[PDB]
Design a protein around this ligand. Structure first.
Ligand SMILES: CCCCCCCC/C=C\CCCCCCCC(=O)OC[C@H](COP(=O)(O)OCC[N+](C)(C)C)OC(=O)CCCCCCC/C=C/CCCCCCCC
Ligand SMILES: CC(C)CCC[C@@H](C)[C@H]1CC[C@H]2[C@@H]3CC=C4C[C@@H](O)CC[C@]4(C)[C@H]3CC[C@]12C
Ligand SMILES: *[C@@H]1O[C@H](CO)[C@@H](O)[C@H](O)[C@H]1NC(C)=O
Ligand SMILES: *[C@@H]1O[C@H](CO)[C@@H](O)[C@H](O)[C@H]1NC(C)=O
Ligand SMILES: *[C@@H]1O[C@H](CO)[C@@H](O)[C@H](O)[C@H]1NC(C)=O
Ligand SMILES: *[C@@H]1O[C@H](CO)[C@@H](O)[C@H](O)[C@H]1NC(C)=O
Ligand SMILES: *[C@@H]1O[C@H](CO)[C@@H](O)[C@H](O)[C@H]1NC(C)=O
Ligand code: ALF
Ligand SMILES: [K+]
Ligand SMILES: [K+]
Ligand SMILES: [K+]
Ligand SMILES: [Mg+2]
Lengths: 987, 262
């Protein structure tokens, strides 16, 4: 039913099938019944998951669930302790509130991370027309398109969209453009003749939401609503699984790693606390504290902020992303499936090659006129330019003087527009030149002539001679021609000249070009006076014995930056596949021109032609290039499709439907590859939705393509693709560095709790201090690492392996946690013991002191000097220990942010101060720490004490040790690139 | 062979062991240097010991704070408090004060040289009999049997802390909420007026004075109503002792709830 076979059926068979008539139409009652049974002729929008449901989903995950459990434990402990009258434990309630706030803020950041600002349904809704002329039991009337049913009479008034899938019954010069189906704006003739077996290629089928450019036609409704071709395209675009981006996958991977390690640590130390003697309440509080200390509370927010900064930097280069996760996926992309028309080409016919003086010239086709021109110093060239300027019917819109010539708005056909633009570019003023040469006679390209000819008058008033100019198909011109202009001389045509012309025509047409022949004949005033009545219907024009001027060919040329961008992408290890709805010859020519097919590469057909052998005997492995059209693609199984993809590294797909583009993209994705799709069309929208990264053009892109894509090229540069690949690789490396910096500090805040539990020293670090470290002091230094430059030439590297290469891997985690956090913990404990000993508590006395230290019924505890202490004084000393450990972590994190700038290069080589953002972040961190330490009231509000400068200075040697150790490790990695050192201590 | 082969595991484990041994050695060296820098007699800083804390005996504790309750008609509610006072004063018995010497200067006992045995400083002798009636020798109930309990009040010792020598530091006990119609608390002090002699200060440390004993003041509560929830605050009246600290209720003063049933 949905598949159209009605183009293959006769009119009577169609009438019997649809219970309708070609002339009368339906009856009102039966039309109403069919409308009731089928539904309206409208695209049904599939509603997606709501925003509140998505945001609630953002409040779940490993880290979110861990923080929720910790907050629940805090609330339970507070509630139990409140029942016993121990009201001095408001810290548990405050910590639970802080954890809830952290969860909510992280959920908000995650929602911002994946937010989409595109509504693809509206774009398809605007494509649907609202008027449809219908004939129901006679009495032709006009209604809305939604009230159309399968089998119904409709009139095709020119300038209106087709209101349904319609099989043409009668047509009178009707012409449409199937741009929403093919990506091509070329007008298509519609006639009641089945010219092809496929409904997408036949001439007797019109398609829903397609413009009728000119003419009138009548037809019978075949499909309505979602059963139409455009309805299926819209359903396919809307109904695609929202598969996770690579950055989302990596984030989930390291979140699972962190959650598993947190569960392990908390569980084993809960068991240890229970075993060595502790209440279940105390042990669960210990589990909460361990989870809070280990889990990075601001990691996801920092990742989102880094993505936002990269997005801002990308938007500074005319490249906007619909969601933040798109800023990375263009890096690590291994395959680019690219549209041709409007994406690689300019979507505008341009004069490319000329054949005059027995030589083929190449005209500059760049939109900025920056390419190399051809020779324009021949009398034959001047004659040919005069012919092509005079044989112009295209009109120019006034007021376009400042508009660049390629961007001008021209009223005329595509070929006429191209010829007039070429005349404007080469010759001074085409309209002026045509004005100085009035046309006494003119024969339009109406019909039955197959050429355009006009008779003009010489510009010079002293010459009453007339010049006749002719333009048409090359062979038609050749049979009319009798001589050829060579080097400004008229030479009679002979066998050699005819053979040369035929060879040039064949070679020029083999490059997917639209060749047109031009010729001229100088008339005489004796034959026709200047005031002669050149009646068009009088046949008075002789149109014989003309002189050939030359050949002009036109193509939709590539954009100026496209070849270099493709070359750079292929240098970066990315495979570029060309998928287009255009004809195979033009597709192969454009692929060769833009670099998708490299010089020297040959297809199986090319090899067969060169070796004068049938294609079946040619080995497929010899051909580096291959072109597959839609027929072969639909006949091909998935196994043969993947076999062809693996066999031919240079692949071009031509004359493909949107479904076939989707099939190619999914086939590439099923091979474990990150696939990028660049398109600017409604036919491109499903592939754009399916691709991991979908890129659309700004100006040339349609609304459906822009809504389906998650990256828009505002200026249509197509070098922004190279920019995005570079920036994605950069952000991957910088995210590695930032996550390492964030992770390294979780160990120096977890070790104090384990030591406190096991050896019963007074508590060295508090949960509030841990939260301050996580959320206030170190967020900016970690975010500032996103401005790091590339250490090497990342554009000469191959794309990363999605399975092998992870954002956070075992070397990174092991180094960051153990090697660095161990030094940070040693610094913190050295400072802790120093601060304790300066106040009278020696380390040996500190060992096992916790039960007496935290005893409220013990107000005269003696220190190492015999001085007796109250509980409040001991608590203030404990807050001093908190602040000392905090400052040690701060200094070690300054050293860490210094060493995280490079993964392989030296800090001296990359420059200490080249990252002004990093320097400002370090200064801000130090200032915030100083404010926290020395603001009045901090001891009672946040338990921060004014510490002495010696406790600022103690962790500095440890920070220096961190810097020196990382420098030595990187030096060894550089010096020995394939040793055990490089294998094991590189991340 | 998980992740890496067995030999690679050996090498990486050996590297981590060497790394952690080096780091532990660095930490031990830092601790050793710190302990060599530490002064064995005087602490480097006393930032948390600006004012001494005050405790008392007996120290039965409620959940909210110090709370003492007993019944004069029931001897079971008295034995614990009497035993606590006895075991506390056992350390102040004269057999335990042998290492100390008799002091009569009534002024700061400044010592700049180690003239006592063990190369130590001299410490002054405080015997339990200096608490006369509340010493427990003539009355073993410590006043709890007649409804006039004795409370021993001592201030925490701080090295080189001087409470002020214009007059000896004094203990003053009074009701926290002064009753309008009720008479004020009447307390008899042992020693007379409840003063700590100035020759017990300065405290020089555990190494310098291994036999140092905190001077004691016994507060005999005379005028206490029965079957009432009274609250008594005892503070130290010294020039350099401050009791105005909201965060530390035990600094320079001690507050307890008393309830004498009948
Ligand atoms: C998975 C791998 C884990 C590896 C962990 C490291 C294990 C080894 C680390 C430490 C072990 C003990 C090292 C002790 C070094 C002491 C050096 C020393 O000779 O000093 C002498 C002092 C005694 O002096 P005194 O009393 O005579 O002085 C009196 C003052 N005067 C002299 C002025 C009169 O001896 C002392 O203090 C002894 C007490 C020292 C304090 C130890 C308290 C335990 C705390 C441990 C926390 C460590 C956390 C590590 C975090 C690693 C993260 C991965
Ligand atoms: C070091 C002394 C004090 C204790 C020795 C304990 C041993 C058995 C422990 C402590 C440190 C541990 C290592 C710490 C880090 C790593 C890197 C990781 O990617 C694989 C496991 C590995 C290699 C661990 C293996 C087991 C290990 C060597
Ligand atoms: C004190 O003890 C007596 C018994 O010796 C008892 O009767 C009395 O109720 C107790 N005091 C109070 C008021 O609880
Ligand atoms: C310390 O001095 C005391 C004084 O009584 C003496 O009993 C003891 O033996 C001495 N100990 C040492 C080790 O000198
Ligand atoms: C304490 O004992 C002495 C000597 O027996 C006596 O004089 C004094 O009055 C007693 N004080 C009180 C109030 O019991
Ligand atoms: C108190 O001690 C100071 C020295 O700190 C001394 O000068 C002064 O005379 C002393 N006053 C009294 C009353 O003993
Ligand atoms: C302190 O006690 C003595 C008796 O030793 C007495 O003479 C003096 O007046 C008392 N001081 C005060 C302030 O009552
Ligand atoms: F513009 Al196309 F296939 F070439 F959509
Ligand atoms: K943490
Ligand atoms: K997509
Ligand atoms: K996708
Ligand atoms: Mg296109």
């Amino acid at each position: 039913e949905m598949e159209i076979n009605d183009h293959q059926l006769s009119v009577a068979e169609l009438e019997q099938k649809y219970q309708t008539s070609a002339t009368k139409g339906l009856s009102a009652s039966l039309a109403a019944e069919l409308l009731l049974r089928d539904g309206p002729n409208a695209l049904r929008p599939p509603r997606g998951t709501p925003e509140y449901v998505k945001f609630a989903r953002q409040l779940a995950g490993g880290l979110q669930c861990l923080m929720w459990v910790a907050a629940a434990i805090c609330l339970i402990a507070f509630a139990i302790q409140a029942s016993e009258g121990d009201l001095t434990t408001d810290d548990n309630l405050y910590l639970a509130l802080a954890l809830i706030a952290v969860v909510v803020v992280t959920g908000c950041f995650g929602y911002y991370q994946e937010f989409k600002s595109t509504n693809i349904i509206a774009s398809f809704k605007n494509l649907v027309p609202q008027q449809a002329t219908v004939i129901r039991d006679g009495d032709k009337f006009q209604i809305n398109a939604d009230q159309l049913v399968v089998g119904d009479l409709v009139e095709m008034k020119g300038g209106d969209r087709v209101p349904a899938d319609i099989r043409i019954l009668q047509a009178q010069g009707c012409k449409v453009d199937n741009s929403s189906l093919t990506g091509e704006s070329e007008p298509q003739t519609r006639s009641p003749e089945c010219t092809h077996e496929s409904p997408l290629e036949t001439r007797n089928i019109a398609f829903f939401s397609t413009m009728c450019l000119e003419g009138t036609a009548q037809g019978l409704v075949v499909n309505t609503g979602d059963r139409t071709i455009i309805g299926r395209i819209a359903s396919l675009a809307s109904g695609v699984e929202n598969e996770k981006t690579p950055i989302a996958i990596e984030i989930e991977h390291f979140v699972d790693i962190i959650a598993g390690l947190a569960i392990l640590f908390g569980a084993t130390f809960f068991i240890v606390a229970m075993c060595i003697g502790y209440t279940f309440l105390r042990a669960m509080v210990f589990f909460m504290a361990i989870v809070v200390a280990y889990v990075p509370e601001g990691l996801l927010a920092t990742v989102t902020v880094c993505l936002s900064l990269t997005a801002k930097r990308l938007a500074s280069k005319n490249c906007v992303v619909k969601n933040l996760e798109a800023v990375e996926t263009l890096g690590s992309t291994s395959v680019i499936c690219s549209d041709k028309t409007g994406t690689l080409t300019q979507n505008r016919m341009t004069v490319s090659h000329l054949w005059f003086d027995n030589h083929i010239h190449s005209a500059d086709t760049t939109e900025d006129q920056s390419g190399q021109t051809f020779d324009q110093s021949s009398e034959t060239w001047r004659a040919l330019c005069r012919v092509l300027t005079l044989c112009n019917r295209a009109a120019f819109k006034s007021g376009q003087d400042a508009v660049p010539v390629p961007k001008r708005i021209v009223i005329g056909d595509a070929s006429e527009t191209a010829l007039l633009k070429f005349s404007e570019l080469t010759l001074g003023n085409a309209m002026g030149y045509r004005e100085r040469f009035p046309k006494v006679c003119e024969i339009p390209f109406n019909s039955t002539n197959k050429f355009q000819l006009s008779i003009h008058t010489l510009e010079d008033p002293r010459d009453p001679r007339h010049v006749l100019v002719m333009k048409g198909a090359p062979e038609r011109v050749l049979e009319r021609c009798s001589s050829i202009l060579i080097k400004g001389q008229e030479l009679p045509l002979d066998e050699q000249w005819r053979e040369a012309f035929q060879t040039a025509y064949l070679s020029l047409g083999g490059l997917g070009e639209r060749v047109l022949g031009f010729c001229q004949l100088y008339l005489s005033e004796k034959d026709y006076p200047p005031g002669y009545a050149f009646d068009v219907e009088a046949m008075n024009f002789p149109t014989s014995g003309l002189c050939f001027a030359g050949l002009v060919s036109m193509i939709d040329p590539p954009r100026a930056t496209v070849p270099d961008a493709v070359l750079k992408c292929r240098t970066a290890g990315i495979r570029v596949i060309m998928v287009t709805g255009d004809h195979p010859i033009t597709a192969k020519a454009i692929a060769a021109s833009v670099g998708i097919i490299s010089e020297g590469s040959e297809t199986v057909e090319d090899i067969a032609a060169r070796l004068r052998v049938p294609v079946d005997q040619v080995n497929r492995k010899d051909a580096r290039a291959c072109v597959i059209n839609g027929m072969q693609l639909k006949d091909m199984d998935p196994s043969e499709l993947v076999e062809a993809l693996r066999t031919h590294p240079e692949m071009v797909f031509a004359r493909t439907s949107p479904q076939q583009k989707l099939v190619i993209v999914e086939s590439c994705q099923r091979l474990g590859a990150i696939v990028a799709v660049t398109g600017d069309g409604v036919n491109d929208s499903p592939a754009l939705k399916k691709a991991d990264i979908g890129v659309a053009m700004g100006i040339a892109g349609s609304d459906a393509a822009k809504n389906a894509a998650d990256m828009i090229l505002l200026d249509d540069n197509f070098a922004s693709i190279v920019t995005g690949v570079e920036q994605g690789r950069l952000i991957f490396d910088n995210l590695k560095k930032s996550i390492a910096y964030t992770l390294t500090k979780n160990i120096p805040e977890l070790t104090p709790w384990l030591i406190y539990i096991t050896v019963s020293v007074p508590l060295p670090l508090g949960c509030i201090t841990i939260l301050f470290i996580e959320l206030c002091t170190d967020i900016f230094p970690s975010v500032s690492l996103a401005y790091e430059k590339a250490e090497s030439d990342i554009m000469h590297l191959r794309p990363r392996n999605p399975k092998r290469d992870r954002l956070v891997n075992e070397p990174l985690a092991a180094y960051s946690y153990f090697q660095i956090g161990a030094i940070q913990s040693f610094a913190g404990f050295t400072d802790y013991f120093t601060a304790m000993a300066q106040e009278g508590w020696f380390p040996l006395l500190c060992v096992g002191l916790r039960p007496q230290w935290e005893n409220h019924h013990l107000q005269d505890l003696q220190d190492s000097y015999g001085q007796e202490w109250t509980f409040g004084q001991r608590l203030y000393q404990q807050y001093t220990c908190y602040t000392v450990f905090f400052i040690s972590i701060q200094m070690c994190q300054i050293a860490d942010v210094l060493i995280r700038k490079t993964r392989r290069l030296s800090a001296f080589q990359q420059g200490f101060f080249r990252n002004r953002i990093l320097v400002i972040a370090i200064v801000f961190q130090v200032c915030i720490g100083c404010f926290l330490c020395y603001c009045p009231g901090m001891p009672n509000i946040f338990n921060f004490m004014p510490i002495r400068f010696q406790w600022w200075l103690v962790p500095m040697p440890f920070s220096l040790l961190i810097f020196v150790y990382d420098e030595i490790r990187k030096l060894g990695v550089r010096c020995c690139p394939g040793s055990w050192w490089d294998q094991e201590l590189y991340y | 062979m998980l992740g890496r082969t067995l030999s690679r595991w050996v090498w990486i484990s050996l590297y981590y062991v060497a790394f952690y041994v080096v780091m532990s050695g660095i930490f031990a060296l830092c601790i050793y240097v710190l302990m060599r820098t530490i002064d064995p007699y005087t602490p480097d800083y006393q930032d948390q010991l600006k004012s001494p804390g005050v405790t008392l005996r007996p120290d039965v504790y409620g959940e909210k704070g110090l709370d003492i309750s007993y019944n004069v008609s029931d001897s079971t509610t008295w034995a614990g408090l009497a035993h606590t006072l006895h075991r506390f004063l056992a350390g102040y018995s004269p057999a335990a004060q042998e290492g100390s010497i008799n002091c009569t200067s009534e002024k700061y006992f400044f010592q700049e040289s180690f003239l006592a045995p063990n190369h130590t400083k001299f410490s002054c002798k405080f015997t339990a009999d200096m608490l006369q009636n509340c010493s427990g020798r003539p009355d073993p109930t410590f006043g709890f049997a007649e409804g006039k309990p004795c409370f021993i009040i001592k201030m925490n010792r701080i090295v080189k802390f001087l409470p002020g020598n214009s007059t000896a530091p004094r203990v003053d006990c009074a009701f926290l909420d002064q009753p309008r119609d009720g008479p004020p608390l009447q307390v008899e002090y042992f020693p007379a007026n409840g003063t700590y002699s100035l020759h017990y200060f300065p405290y020089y440390g555990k190494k310098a004075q291994p036999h140092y004993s905190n001077p004691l003041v016994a507060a005999k509560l005379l005028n206490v109503p029965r079957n009432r929830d009274v609250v008594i605050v005892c503070k130290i009246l010294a020039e350099h002792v401050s009791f105005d600290n909201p965060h530390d209720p035990y600094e320079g003063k001690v507050e307890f709830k008393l309830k004498i049933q009948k």
